[PDB]
Nucleic acid binder design. Structure first.
Lengths: 76, 100
DNA sequence: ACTCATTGTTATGCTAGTGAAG
DNA sequence: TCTTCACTAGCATAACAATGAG
């Protein structure tokens, strides 16, 4: 089953949280994720740019690969 | 002329529109915003979603189709411009650093 | 097999607002 | 003016991407 493509945050967050867990284990991902949203908010456009371009490339490749994808949630 | 052929052409167009917006890296919200800016009429993310889902009045689909065509033209122009400019900067910086 | 956080992109339930025909 | 009926563009907000320990 095809999973929905990841945004720019998700890309950067994925990068960070691996190093952060290597660095300091027995830290739960809840503290981790609060920390990373906090951090990401503080970056400039300049800083964000490669992750933005990366997520663009990912969405492009996802559509290219699965042409007939449609995001189908399960609403409450 | 008939609703069958028109809906067929429109549904294929909607697919093509999505294709292009993805390959150009615009979010749905982005397309709305830019359409807003270059035709002076705001368009919500919602209506764009509805468009790409062929969940709009045939009239509305065909009402927006010209606007999207002009948008796609302008978008693609900007892409080509940026692409050429970027590679230009590349060649420039390269040669410069090299000789220096 | 969950819940847990986070940002950002998408789908859509849910309007308050707008007429048409009785 | 008030009542249903049916659409309607937009406003909200939840769903789901990654990750893996509780």
């Amino acid at each position: 089953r095809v999973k929905r493509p990841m945004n720019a945050f998700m890309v950067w967050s994925r990068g960070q949280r691996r190093k952060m867990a290597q660095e300091n284990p027995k830290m739960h991902n809840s503290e981790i994720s609060k920390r990373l949203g906090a951090e990401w908010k503080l970056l400039s456009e300049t800083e964000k740019r490669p992750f933005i371009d990366e997520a663009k490339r990912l969405r492009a490749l996802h559509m290219k690969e699965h042409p007939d994808y449609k995001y189908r949630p399960r609403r409450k | 002329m008939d609703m069958k052929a028109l809906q067929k052409e429109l549904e294929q167009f909607a697919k093509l529109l999505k294709q292009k917006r993805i390959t150009l890296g615009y979010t749905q919200a982005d397309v709305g915003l830019t359409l807003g800016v270059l035709f002076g009429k705001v368009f919500s993310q919602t209506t764009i979603s509805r468009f790409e889902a062929l969940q709009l009045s045939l009239k509305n689909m065909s009402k927006l189709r010209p606007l999207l065509e002009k948008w796609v033209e302008e978008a693609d122009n900007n892409e080509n411009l940026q692409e050429i400019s970027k590679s230009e900067t590349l060649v420039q910086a390269r040669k410069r650093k090299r000789t220096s």
